Amino acid sequence: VGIEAAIVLIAFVIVAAALAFVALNMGLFTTQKSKEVMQRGLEE
Amino acid sequence: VGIEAAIVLIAFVIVAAALAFVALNMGLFTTQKSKEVMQRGLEE
Amino acid sequence: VGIEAAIVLIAFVIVAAALAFVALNMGLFTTQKSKEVMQRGLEEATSALEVDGSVIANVTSGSVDAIAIPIKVSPGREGVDMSVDKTTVRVMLPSKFYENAYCGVFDGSSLSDSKLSTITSSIACTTGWAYLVIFNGDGDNVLELGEKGLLVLELPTPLNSYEEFKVEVRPVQGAALTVERIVPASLPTGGAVSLG
Amino acid sequence: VGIEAAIVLIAFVIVAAALAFVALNMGLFTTQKSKEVMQRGLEE
């Protein structure tokens, strides 16, 4: 009974880790691009 | 007495493995699509 | 009549004992592995790594030669391993694409001083160009909180004016860092130029 | 017939207890670390 619950837990944790990786990567990229675009606006 | 319990255990573990496979596959796909859609939003 | 029943009972009890032994052994192992995997997931959640400041480039003879990208670790400590065999740096150029230009991490002993020319000149890599320089570190190849890292590219005759470049870092654990900048129109004949 | 069933029951209960111990320990640790990381984020 416990073993399958542990397997499901492992799967759900692994899914969450991938979501976190994607979220941080894209958030950092979009923050950098926002910095660049507002810098360009100030230049303009 | 033990043997049928072992068989039920094997079946339940195998079910959990299939659920985990599906969960990871679809989670990775949906994370990738979320990355793509937010990238497209930033482009727009 | 009783004796054979006792023998069957002994056999069935012995079978149950073996099943119990197997069940406890494998249950303990799988619980330990679940603990380890969720711990690793929590580790992967943190250790983001991010750009701290402005990218600064070296220009010689009217063209950009070297690029310095300042990075730091995100809140949450849990440092990122910057070893040669565990980290890969991707450089995407207008006419070139490089999958792995990482050569390693050399300690920032402050050299003679913190000049960009001194850093780009004293440090050399046997193969590849991109290396990372740690400041205020303890001498390890892991970037931790309290340590400032400056990642340097040595580019032989790329990067004229106005074209874009893309630099990506791929740690073994944590999110990949994406850096994209455009070279400004105004470039001095020498010295560092800020890329914003 | 009953005795082996009791032995299997004891084994399965003991397995569940170990799973519970691991689950509570790691859950408390991860909750504490989440508290710390969000506190650090607020500080930042």
From Swiss-Prot, chains A, B, D:
Where does the sequence pass through the membrane?
none
The role this protein plays is: Flagellin is the subunit protein which polymerizes to form the filaments of archaeal flagella.
What is stated as this protein's family in its record?
Belongs to the archaeal flagellin family.
Q: Which organism is it from?
A: Aeropyrum pernix (strain ATCC 700893 / DSM 11879 / JCM 9820 / NBRC 100138 / K1)
- GO MF, one annotated term: structural molecule activity
Give compartment(s): Archaeal flagellum
Gene name per UniProt: flaB1
Protein's name according to its UniProt entry: Probable flagellin 1
Q: Say which domain of life the source belongs to.
A: Archaea
Biological process (GO) annotations held by this record are: archaeal or bacterial-type flagellum-dependent cell motility
> What main location does UniProt list?
other
UniProt GO cellular component terms: archaeal-type flagellum
- Record's keyword terms, sorted: Archaeal flagellum
Swiss-Prot record, chain C:
Q: One GO CC annotation, please?
A: archaeal-type flagellum
Keywords, alphabetical: Archaeal flagellum
Can the keyword rRNA-binding be found in this entry's annotation? no
Q: Which InterPro entries match?
A: Flagellin/pilin_N_arc, Flagellin_arc
Q: Which residues form a coiled coil?
A: none
The record, for Pfam families, names: Arch_flagellin
Q: Which domain of life is it from?
A: Archaea
Which biological process, per GO, is one annotated for this protein? archaeal or bacterial-type flagellum-dependent cell motility
Where does it reside? Archaeal flagellum
**Which GO molecular function annotations are given, in alphabetical order?**
structural molecule activity
Keyword Electron transport assigned to the entry: answer is no
Functional note: Flagellin is the subunit protein which polymerizes to form the filaments of archaeal flagella.
Give the family this protein belongs to, as stated in its UniProt record: Belongs to the archaeal flagellin family.
- What PANTHER family does the database record attribute to this sequence? FLAGELLIN B1
Q: What is this protein called?
A: Probable flagellin 1
The species this protein belongs to is Aeropyrum pernix (strain ATCC 700893 / DSM 11879 / JCM 9820 / NBRC 100138 / K1)
Q: Which gene encodes it?
A: flaB1
